[PDB]
Amino acid sequence: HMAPPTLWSRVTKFGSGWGFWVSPTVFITTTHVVPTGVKEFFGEPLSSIAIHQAGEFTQFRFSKKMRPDLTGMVLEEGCPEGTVCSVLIKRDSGELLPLAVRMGAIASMRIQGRLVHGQSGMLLLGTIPGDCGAPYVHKRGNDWVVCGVHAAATKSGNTVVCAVQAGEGETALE
Ligand SMILES: *[C@@H](O)[C@H](C[C@@H]1CCNC1=O)NC(=O)[C@H](CC1CCCCC1)NC(=O)OCc1ccccc1
C-alpha cells in the first residue's frame, strides 16, 4: 500500500522534527521535538490550544480550523502485533522516505534515561536525527489509520520505536 499525496500533506515540519494533522484541528507529534520557550504554535497562542502530553506522545487540539482542507482520520493506540506499518518520513530536502516496519509489542521502555510508552518494530535506509514525529500509518480497508509518532531507534537502526497515546489494556505489556 502506497500512501496518497493528501496523506503525506498531513506530515508537517515542526520544531526539531515533524508532526501530523489527524484532522483540521488535531496535530500529533513527539514530545521532545516540540519547541520550548515559545508563546504560540502555528501562530495560535498556547492558551487557545488544548495540549495533551503523555510521555513522548503530544497532541494539540486547536481552537480554530488549521487544516480545513482535511477530513478527520482515525488515530489508534498502536496496532496489533505483526501489523506492517509505513513510517511516513519526510526529509528536510523534501524527499519522501516511506519505511516499512513490522510492529511489535506495546510497552513502557527505558530509552535514553526515561520511560517511554510506545511500540517497537522491525524495519523491513533507516531513520536518522531529524525524523522524529513522523507518523506510523497502516491501511484498513480503503482508509488509512495513524497509530504512533516516530521517537527512537537502536544504534544499528533495525529496531524503531513510535510513541503512542496513553492507555493500558490487555494487549500491551504492563
Ligand atoms: C528523533 O529525534 C530521533 C530519531 C533517532 C535518532 C537516530 N535514529 C532515530 O531513529 N530520536 C532520538 O534521538 C531519541 C530521542 C529520545 C527518545 C526518548 C525520549 C527522549 C529523547 N534518542 C534515541 O533514539 O537514542 C538512541 C540512539 C540511536 C542512535 C545513536 C545514538 C542513540
Q: Quote the radius of gyration of the chain (alpha carbons, Å).
A: 15
Compute the distance between CA of residue 60 and CA of residue 138 in angstroms, rounded to an integer: 22
Instruction: Determine contact, residues 27/146, Cβ cutoff 8 Å.
Output: no
Compute the distance between CA of residue 98 and CA of residue 15 in angstroms, rounded to an integer: 21
Residue 2 DSSP one-character state: -
Residues 165, 92 within the same domain? yes
- Which residue, 145, 140, 99, is CA-closest to 121? 99
127 ligand 1 Cβ < 6 A: yes
Solving technique for this entry? Answer: X-ray
Residues 12, 37 within the same domain? yes
8 φ/ψ angles, rounded to the nearest 5 degrees: -55, -35
Mapped onto helix, strand or coil, the DSSP state of residue 41 is strand
Range of the domain at 90: 73-174
- Which residue, 147, 20, 6, 27, is CA-closest to 70? 6
Q: Which grid coordinates are listed for 89?
A: 518520513
Name the residue with the closest Cα to ligand 1, atom 30: 155
The distance of Cα 87 from the centroid of its chain, to the nearest Å, equals 9
Residues 78, 153 within the same domain? yes
43 CB-near residues (< 8 Å, 6+ apart)? none
Burial class (CB within 10 angstroms; exposed 0-12, middle 13-18, buried 19+) of 94: exposed
Residues 114, 132 within the same domain? yes
Residues 85, 44 within the same domain? no
Per-residue 3-state assignment (H helix, E strand, C coil) for 154-169: CCCCCEEEEECCCCCC
Instruction: Determine contact, residues 148/138, Cβ cutoff 8 Å.
Output: no
Catalytic residues: 32, 56, 132
Residues 49, 64 within the same domain? yes
Strand order of the β-sheet with 49-54 is 11-14, 17-21, 26-30, 57-62, 49-54
Q: Which of 72, 94, 109 is the last residue of a domain?
A: 72
Q: Which grid coordinates are listed for 65?
A: 480550523
Compute the distance between CA of residue 128 and CA of residue 21 in angstroms, rounded to an integer: 22
Looking at the structure of the chain, the number of domains it has is 2
105 ligand 1 Cβ < 6 A: no
> Quick count: other Cβ atoms within 10 Å of Cβ 159?
16
Alpha-carbon distances, residue 77 vs 30, 46, 117, 162, 173 (angstroms): 14, 25, 10, 10, 13
Mapped onto helix, strand or coil, the DSSP state of residue 37 is coil
Which amino acid, one-letter code, is at 131?
Answer: D
- Which residue, 100, 55, 57, 103, is CA-closest to 79? 103
